[PDB]
Amino acid sequence: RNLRVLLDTAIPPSFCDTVSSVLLDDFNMVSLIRTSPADSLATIKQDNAEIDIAITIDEELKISRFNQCVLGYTKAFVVAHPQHPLCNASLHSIASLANYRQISLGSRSGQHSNLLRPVSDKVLFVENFDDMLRLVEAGVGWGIAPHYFVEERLRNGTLAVLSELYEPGGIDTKVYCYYNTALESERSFLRFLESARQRLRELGRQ
Ligand SMILES: FC(F)(F)c1cc(NCc2cnc(-c3ccc(Oc4ccccc4)cc3)s2)ccn1
């Protein structure tokens, strides 16, 4: 009937709004929460919070009271400041990157998903992407960010990309939809999945 829905901050706005309208058509009351992917799963697991659907890039199989399925995809970029050493290098390996400071989401204390697990031994953590980019643009290091976030800075030369040999066009990242088990049998939920997936496909095409 009613729904509390979490969407992590790597899910682009177009994607969010898509999920929003589908859920508002197929459900009654809809509430949204936004969190960094580092805190996405960590949030829903709290028995205290009552989140019924959670849409995030963070991977985790067997979570209590929740299912998993794939809703769509999003693309992320390895970015650094344009005069950063790694940009004047052209060549790319994960070791070349590991010898420099990563600016990464998450808190050092705690189980870091293999997704947000820093690659460098020299890391500097942040709470959100705004802060991450503050440091990157100040040449303090390099980071991983959503496309929608850094599109602007890349258009404007503010910011470079280090991932264009690894995966041209950025790094495809699954978007998982962890759904409370009680919804498995709700035809409203199944309709939502169907419609949101179709729309997101038509959108990814564009
Ligand atoms: F949310 C968000 F921001 F999109 C986001 C998505 C994520 N997805 C999974 C990945 C985690 N590490 C990825 C990665 C890192 C460094 C790479 O370096 C290079 C460079 C050039 C040649 C070879 C290797 C390549 C791939 S991909 C992770 C974190 N954050």
UniProtKB/Swiss-Prot annotation:
Subcellular location: Cell inner membrane; Secreted
Cellular component aspect of the GO annotation: extracellular region; plasma membrane
Chief location bin: membrane
GO molecular function, one term: DNA binding
Keywords per UniProt: Cell inner membrane, Cell membrane, DNA-binding, Membrane, Secreted, Transcription, Transcription regulation, Virulence
Function: Transcription regulator that plays a critical role in virulence by positively regulating the expression of multiple quorum sensing (QS)-regulated virulence factors, genes involved in protein secretion, translation, response to oxidative stress and the phnAB operon. At the stationary phase, negatively autoregulates its function through cleavage and translocation to the extracellular space.
Family: Belongs to the LysR transcriptional regulatory family.
Subunit structure as annotated in this protein's UniProt entry: Forms homooligomers.
Full protein name: Multiple virulence factor regulator MvfR
